[PDB]
Design a protein around this ligand. Structure first.
Ligand SMILES: Nc1ncnc2c1ncn2[C@@H]1O[C@H](COP(=O)(O)OP(=O)(O)OP(=O)(O)O)[C@@H](O)[C@H]1O
Ligand SMILES: Nc1ncnc2c1ncn2[C@@H]1O[C@H](COP(=O)(O)OP(=O)(O)O)[C@@H](O)[C@H]1O
Ligand SMILES: [Mg+2]
Lengths: 128, 578, 41, 40, 470, 385, 312
């Protein structure tokens, strides 16, 4: 008798999973198209500032060649180096003084990092 | 105070740096959470601190602050009626604070700092005071709690607080040198409290049970051991000891028992009523409870806390009874701690210094002259629960070399509906010869000989059990059947005792003396009757037998008349009846 | 029965002694290795 | 029998599509909330 | 995203990483090599010079030049919710039933806090398991820790599955307050093989017990630390359900010997000096931290009950594992190899079994009024008949007294009918009827343990196992 | 990797009556055969290699003696594959690493053999893997760990020994290959504890993961009774799943007969305590009958000679017939004992020699010889009245 | 030592039984001593001189007062010489190693001096491999006429078969000849206990065309009967001899006769046929129906002879 409604439970669980995956892929795509917007130089500053103040005594900084003009004014006054990179798309990375530790701040990484906290809020909003 | 930081975390061990000047075995607080720890090893600017609780989530660099004093307890008013864990933390306040769980780093005070007590000074300004003297009096559940100057404090009194309502914390007496005496002090649990002189134990500890008092007695300030088999009435016997003993104050120690056992002993006691006043029994007791999942250090320090509290109440001039629920669990905790330090195991994993610690703990008991000149005593009863009931185990063997009495419980008699189920074989007491003069002066001049006659009768009954098994009781000689019936009479009328009877739970010495005299008189007259010619089965229906069997269940103030009537019926019954 | 009990006691004692020997040797060699690899570097 | 199994599958499908249509009405609000939270 | 490179040493399950002060003791880290593969690890020692990480799985491809380590949690946590019922997990919270991940209501530390002793209350009600040898003679009380002692080849898995499938509460017999509270079963299996995993999955699916239970399954080839963490996850979920949603939870722990051996491997991997018989010296406290998470709490209606299962290695009760378990728990259920070979299932031997809380969960108001007396009489009669079976082989059937023939017949019928119940589910009343039918074979007046009114009420009945006890 | 694991439901025919009947092993299951030196592990493994229904046999001789290793290399090219009639070496892969060869090769030979077996399974056959001595591989791990200056766990072994053992044994099982075809790998490994001490850590670790366990007795090996399988100390967890196969391929009552034989053995084992305490003469008539029947089963059914031309292999139906004959004889003996005749008079019946010589009949003559044996058994007691 | 010397003196092959080969050359003896005392060394020297075999013997002597580390190399040198002779000059070499226990003691000394991790009882972990590097240097090579045969001798400390040295040696070698102190104390020589001993290569050397045909069956029957006799001894230790049946008394008498006649032979040399005749005379004590392991035709051909007839 219970294995019958077990099908209902599994179907509703997978429906919840499908809609949540829909939300997740939509937000991932939304973060993907952001760099081309002119607001992207306003976000690279925040990301690099937070990363740099998160790592005391950083040596250099890594960013895409496109964002170097936006950070060069910031990096020079912060007293750090700036290096171009084909990778590190829509993200920044700072190395430690010894070079053995790193800090990164990326949208596609922050989403995966905070999805655990945001799942409850998304569920409550969607079915509240 | 000494302050440092953490440089290494590995399990329960924390290695601090910058702690140059800290003292060995002091209490320290680790991290921002302030987890308590104990310094076990010093080297350079590095101290090895042993955390009591779990160390998950700690980080390198978190501050470490040293209290500068070893593990200790707070001694003063407010301890009675209380439930404490291993290191004297009131569990009730913990529940009121953090709910049903015990979170790491809870801070509570042993003595309630808010309750008001009526102060009654006893010293006057200008009087000389010296450690152990009485400063005043506070009422507490019918007890006049005497505030004592700490043992090491000496001087001349400058000011005293007048009578009135004050809290625990308030300074009551200030000495000339500026030292202030309040209603409590603090004392390390691993250092014995000093006394004037230890008086040798010359008076018995009336346990309230006939077998215990008459055949295997323990003197005041003595020690005893008792195994813990299942379904044998150990809990009921300990409960009866607490309820009906001569002791003024009861201290109960649980040192790592199962959750349900601790729940039972914590729920049942508050519903009991001590017979002396009819008030709650919990008013005179202090409960120390420890479950299996508590930190090991608390389970190791529980017995020290209990015995120190008992010694304090002894210094007040009372008599205290102390019970250890299972020294086996305490030995287990000690073995675990010894394994943590990578110490070399001695035998079956127990550290070689087990006997020294056991002797040191058991030696604190005794009848002493307090520093204030009064008299006090502490009686320690320790329970030992070996693995398979094997008494060749090292813990039991070490215990047997220092205790003065051994009460061997067995489940066989409990199955045979005999309560208490204490075997008269294997059990022994070493206080009998020393206690003989007291018995001669107090109960009777021939009481020891009567007890010896009872012992000989029981031994002789046990000395022919083989024919009973081989053949049976009916096919026996007249003397043998008489002896076996005498043994059964003794078992069912003197050793068996019900603790649920309103009048039969407690039995004074004189009642037992009368029972033994009656049984011996009956036995002697029966020997004479057979010598002059009689059949035993004729003697089986003498009314004096049902009189002796009903000699129990009578009031103590009703006893002597019953005793004289029974003696006269014994004398007249064996002559009128063949 | 007493003979069996004596044999059992003897066997248990022998096993315990061998366990103690093994533990002592292990601790000694570990201490030496730690000392060489820490103090000498 | 298979009648109870089929009925349970049918009610499962109805519940699943109802949940999906409920969540499709706030897909956009959920996307807005998560984008607001993740973006510094 | 803070990740550390600069590995200085890799050997066995341990790797050393420098400049890792910020890593908290016990944190879970992720190790990524040059191929992009991700491995799990736990920090076991933190110092100013380096931090020591124990790798969950093998370290085949790691190297000192390309390896990097990143943090996951300062402390192990599990996301819990009431929607966990009906799901399967791999022992660290990762689903293995192919269903989408659940949405956690909260994240809790898997190393639960101890219970305050003054907050506990005495167990008072029983749990119907459906086994006559368990319910009638060794009743299980809500809030108890009653392990099952099994051998090497004995069918402990089948017994566990059957108990999990049939266990239920009985508010009907409560007399007053006759209303049901939701019942859940938490099933944790440690160090199982593929065959056992398949059997468990099929058994929990075919009958429909899955929807009322939560499964934490850890295989034999899986990493050891997962086996260590599994029972703590199960107990965390059980505590949460019972004390937040007023559920009645039954926790089943399988093959505690596997957990002990995993503990031994872990302790040796940390280079700690072993205690007696090769086990760590902190094994007693470690097991206590698992067993002592059961019980009942004043002011709350929920309850947690544990049934550990452990295979005695050499059928020896002096082995440290069963010894410590007997120290901590409140009895044991013993499986008999003789009964198993004779074709009787479940092969529970009533004579060496015991429940230390049975007297408080049976009697008037809780069950039928004559429970304890019937259990005592059955125990005495069976023990009496067992030795007569041996005496017959030498003195012969013909030299028997009339009573001994009755005792022989009672023992044989007891083994054939009471113990050998097969797969069928027996209510407490049906089991009591079977017990009274069996007792009827002994002459009236030999039932020394039973009060006269009970005998008058229930004596005189033929076998109801064939009848099915209508 | 594979596609999907499956439930084993097909017996692994070994040719040994005791193993095929009392302690079966499934097609994809695992078995362990511990024992002291001289017990008969290697002979049993060679018997499984020679007589089996597996398509391809992989034999892994870790730490094997030299001469015993050449024994196979010489005798196998002469034998015949039962399924196809070709030479036996055409289905066998031998991985040999004797005692005097390097230690780490002795460590890696196990992995090499199991990987070859997995490959042949992925092709779509039924593969049987024979590991000669797992203890001699644990020795290699211990040696290497001691070289590394690692802190051991117990008796010198490294901590990860149990994990390695579980990882090795868990490669067996009937699977669906990536190509959709069926295949299975069966592992039969032997462990040699020091002095026969079954509490040795390798043996205990192996006992926790295997589906079948064939313990070998030193006493039965000393008196030259083979295969010397300790019945009391052995078990098999595959009996339940193989019953539907037995009910169709052998007989409809085969589980009943097997359970009856197991019950009789258990009864004899129980009575053996009294036998030792007071001697066989103190027993009653029925107990003497049970002891004699147990001895008959032990000596004429479980006992098997590996070198005899006919006794070396036994089909399922032969064992079924022998069991049926013994059970019918036991029932007739019970009926006789109830009618007043005494033991040591039945013991000299003529039919006992005909029953004892049953295991030496060729497979072709057995279907008839069994029928006449049953007729003689029926006619003996009733004519005796 | 006496058993080894007797074996060396009497060992020979039987070309007539195999039907091939003639007058095989006497075995060459390679003798390696490790920590041997002067008493045993002098006895061995005198025995070899009396048998006249020193002209075919290579001796390596490491006396008990010699350095204890030289014992690492002695068996290796002895086996190098033996292998060279056998596989390059077609000699038939017999190797005798006096005491592997002393070799193990030297190995343990060297290992423990290096702070190695002890395996068990202080012995090094690599002891199995080290011993295998010694024992496994024996056998016969395809295409060559020479051979090497090893007879190591080792002392079990306090007669414990579970000691590491005998345990590993049994796990490496191809059987063992375990002496028993009980038989020695009864005056029986050589005190070989047949039950604990074993030979793993026996089936390759017996049967038709190698020895008499009933060899294996006679061996099996003797094993079964002797084991039954020992069991009846254990039983009569409890229930007394009077309560025994006739079958158990016959088994007991068989065990006594076996121990006193088949094992205890002294220094006399027995051919295979004589040993088989004695075995058959012993087996003829039992009832004919008790000899189950032997086929009926063999019983008809050989069974019936009397034991007292053999001795002249
Ligand atoms: N002196 C006694 N007088 C009367 N009843 C007793 C006495 N001692 C034990 N009993 C009976 O035993 C019950 C509980 O004691 P029991 O013998 O079962 O062991 P216990 O005290 O619980 O011991 P443990 O904790 O060591 O198992 C009581 O409720 C009562 O029925
Ligand atoms: N079924 C059997 N038939 C005949 N001989 C056997 C049998 N089993 C074992 N043996 C004998 O036992 C001896 C040792 O056998 P082996 O199988 O090599 O033992 P193990 O390998 O267990 O140490 C050999 O002489 C072998 O002939
Ligand atoms: Mg072998």
């Amino acid at each position: 008798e219970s294995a019958g409604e077990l099908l209902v439970a599994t179907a509703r669980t997978q429906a919840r999973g499908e809609v949540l995956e829909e939300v997740r892929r939509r937000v991932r795509e939304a973060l993907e198209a952001l760099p081309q917007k002119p607001e992207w130089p306003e976000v690279v500053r925040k990301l690099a500032l937070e990363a740099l103040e998160a790592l005391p005594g950083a040596k250099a900084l890594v960013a895409n060649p496109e964002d170097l003009p936006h950070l060069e004014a910031l990096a020079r006054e912060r007293g750090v180096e700036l290096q171009a990179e084909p990778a590190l798309r829509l993200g920044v990375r700072a190395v430690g003084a010894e070079g053995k530790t790193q800090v990164e701040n990326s949208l596609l990484a922050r989403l995966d990092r905070a999805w655990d906290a945001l799942s409850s809020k998304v569920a409550q909003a969607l079915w509240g | 105070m000494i302050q440092g930081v953490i440089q290494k975390i590995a399990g329960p061990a924390v290695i601090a740096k910058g702690m140059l000047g800290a003292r060995m075995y002091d209490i320290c607080k680790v991290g921002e959470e302030g987890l308590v720890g104990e310094i076990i090893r010093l080297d350079g600017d590095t101290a090895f601190v042993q955390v009591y609780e779990d160390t998950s989530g700690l980080k390198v660099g978190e501050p470490v602050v040293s209290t500068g004093l070893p593990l200790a307890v707070e001694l003063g008013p407010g301890m009675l009626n209380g439930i404490y864990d291993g290191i004297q933390r009131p569990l009730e306040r913990i529940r009121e604070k953090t709910g049903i769980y015990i979170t790491r780093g809870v801070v509570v005070h042993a003595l309630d700092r808010e309750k008001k007590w009526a102060w009654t000074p006893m010293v006057k300004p200008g009087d000389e005071v010296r450690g152990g003297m009485v400063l005043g009096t506070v009422p507490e559940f019918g007890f006049t709690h005497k505030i004592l100057v700490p043992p090491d404090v000496r001087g001349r009194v400058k000011e005293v607080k007048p009578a009135g309502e004050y809290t625990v914390e308030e300074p009551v007496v200030v000495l000339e040198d500026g030292t202030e005496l309040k209603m409590y002090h603090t004392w390390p649990v691993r250092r014995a409290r000093p006394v004037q002189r230890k008086l040798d134990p010359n008076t018995p500890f009336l346990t309230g049970m006939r077998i215990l008092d008459v055949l295997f007695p323990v003197a005041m300030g003595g020690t005893a051991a008792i195994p813990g088999p299942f379904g044998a009435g150990k809990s009921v016997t300990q409960q009866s000891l607490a309820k009906w003993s001569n002791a003024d104050v009861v201290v109960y120690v649980g040192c790592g028992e199962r959750g349900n056992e601790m729940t039972d002993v914590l729920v049942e006691f508050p519903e009991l009523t001590d017979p002396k006043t009819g008030g709650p029994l919990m008013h005179r007791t202090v409960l120390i409870a420890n479950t299996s999942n508590m930190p090991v250090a608390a389970r190791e320090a529980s017995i020290y806390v209990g015995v120190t509290i008992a010694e304090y109440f002894r210094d007040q001039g009372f008599s205290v009874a102390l019970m250890a629920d299972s020294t086996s669990r305490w030995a287990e905790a000690l073995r675990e701690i010894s394994s943590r330090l990578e110490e070399m195991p001695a035998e079956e994993g127990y550290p070689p210094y087990l006997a020294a610690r056991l002797a040191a703990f058991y030696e604190r008991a005794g009848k002493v002259i307090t520093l204030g000149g009064e008299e006090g005593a502490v009686t320690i009863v320790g329970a030992v629960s070996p693995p398979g009931g094997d008494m060749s185990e090292p813990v039991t063997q070490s215990t047997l070399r220092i205790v003065g009495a051994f009460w061997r419980l067995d489940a066989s008699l409990a199955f045979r509906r005999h309560f208490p189920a204490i075997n008269w074989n294997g059990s022994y007491s070493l206080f009998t010869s020393a206690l003989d003069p007291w018995y001669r002066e107090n109960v009777a001049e021939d009481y020891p000989e009567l007890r010896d006659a009872i012992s000989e009768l029981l031994q002789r009954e046990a000395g022919l059990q083989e024919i009973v098994q081989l053949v049976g009781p009916d096919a026996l000689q007249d003397a043998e059947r008489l002896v076996i019936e005498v043994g059964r009479i003794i078992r069912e009328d003197f050793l068996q005792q019900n603790a649920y009877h309103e009048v039969d739970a407690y039995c004074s010495m004189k009642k037992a003396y009368g029972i033994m005299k009656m049984i011996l008189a009956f036995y002697k007259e029966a020997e004479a009757a057979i010598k002059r010619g009689v059949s035993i089965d004729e003697i089986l229906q003498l009314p004096v037998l049902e009189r002796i069997g009903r000699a129990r269940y009578v009031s103590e103030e009703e006893f002597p008349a019953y005793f004289e009537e029974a003696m006269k019926e014994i004398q007249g019954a064996f002559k009128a009846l063949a | 029965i007493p003979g069996i009990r004596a044999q059992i006691r003897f066997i248990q004692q022998v096993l315990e002694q061998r366990e103690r020997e093994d533990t002592f040797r292990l601790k000694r060699i570990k201490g030496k290795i730690e000392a060489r690899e820490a103090e000498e570097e | 029998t298979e009648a109870l199994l089929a009925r349970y599958r049918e009610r499962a499908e109805a519940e699943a599509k109802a949940v999906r249509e409920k969540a499709m009405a706030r897909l956009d609000e959920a996307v807005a909330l998560v984008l607001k939270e993740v973006l510094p | 995203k803070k990740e550390y490179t600069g590995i200085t040493y890799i050997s066995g399950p341990l790797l050393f990483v420098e400049n890792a002060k910020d890593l908290a003791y016990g944190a879970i880290v992720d190790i990524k090599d040059g191929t992009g593969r991700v491995r799990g690890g736990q920090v076991i020692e933190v110092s100013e010079e380096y931090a020591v990480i124990q790798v969950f799985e093998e370290t085949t491809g790691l190297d000192l030049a390309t390896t990097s380590v990143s943090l996951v949690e300062d402390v192990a946590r599990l996301g819990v919710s009431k929607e966990m019922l009906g799901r399967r997990f791999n022992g660290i919270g990762k689903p293995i039933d192919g269903l989408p991940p659940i949405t956690p209501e909260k994240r809790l530390p898997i190393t639960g806090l101890p219970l305050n002793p003054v907050a506990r209350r005495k167990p008072e009600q029983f749990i119907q398991t459906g086994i006559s040898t368990i319910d009638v003679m060794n009743t299980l009380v809500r809030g108890q820790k009653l392990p099952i002692f099994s051998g090497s080849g004995l069918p402990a898995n089948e017994i566990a599955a059957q108990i999990a499938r049939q266990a239920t509460v009985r508010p009907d017999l409560s007399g007053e307050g006759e209303k049901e509270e939701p019942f859940a079963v938490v099933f944790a299996a440690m160090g199982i093989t593929q065959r056992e995993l398949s059997y468990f999955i099929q058994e929990f699916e075919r009958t429909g017990a899955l929807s009322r239970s939560v499964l934490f399954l850890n295989k034999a080839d899986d990493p050891t630390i997962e086996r260590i963490l599994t029972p703590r996850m199960a107990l965390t979920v059980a505590e949460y359900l019972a004390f937040e949603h007023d559920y009645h939870v039954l926790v089943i722990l399988t093959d505690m010997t596997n957990y002990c051996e995993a503990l031994r491997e872990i302790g040796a991997a940390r280079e700690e000096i072993p205690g007696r018989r090769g086990y760590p010296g902190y094994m007693y406290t470690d097991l206590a931290t698992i067993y002592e998470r059961a019980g009942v709490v004043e002011g709350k209606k929920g309850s947690v009950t544990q049934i550990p299962i452990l295979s005695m290695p050499d059928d020896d009760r002096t082995h440290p594992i069963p010894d410590l378990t007997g120290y901590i728990t409140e009895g044991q259920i013993q499986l008999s190899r003789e009964l198993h070979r004779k074709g009787i299932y479940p092969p529970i031997d009533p004579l060496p079994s015991l429940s230390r809380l049975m007297n408080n969960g049976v009697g008037k108001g809780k069950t039928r009024e004559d429970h304890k007396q019937v259990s005592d009489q059955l125990y005495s009669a069976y023990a009496n008949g067992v030795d007569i079976r041996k005496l017959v082989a030498i003195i012969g059937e013909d030299a028997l007294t009339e009573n001994d023939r009755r005792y022989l017949q009672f023992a044989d019928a007891f083994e054939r009918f009471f113990i050998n119940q097969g797969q069928q589910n027996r209510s407490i009343e049906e089991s009591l009827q079977i017990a009274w039918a069996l007792l009827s074979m002994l002459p009236q007046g030999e039932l020394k343990r039973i009060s006269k009114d009970h005998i008058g009420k229930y004596y005189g009945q033929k076998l109801e196992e064939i009848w099915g006890a209508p």
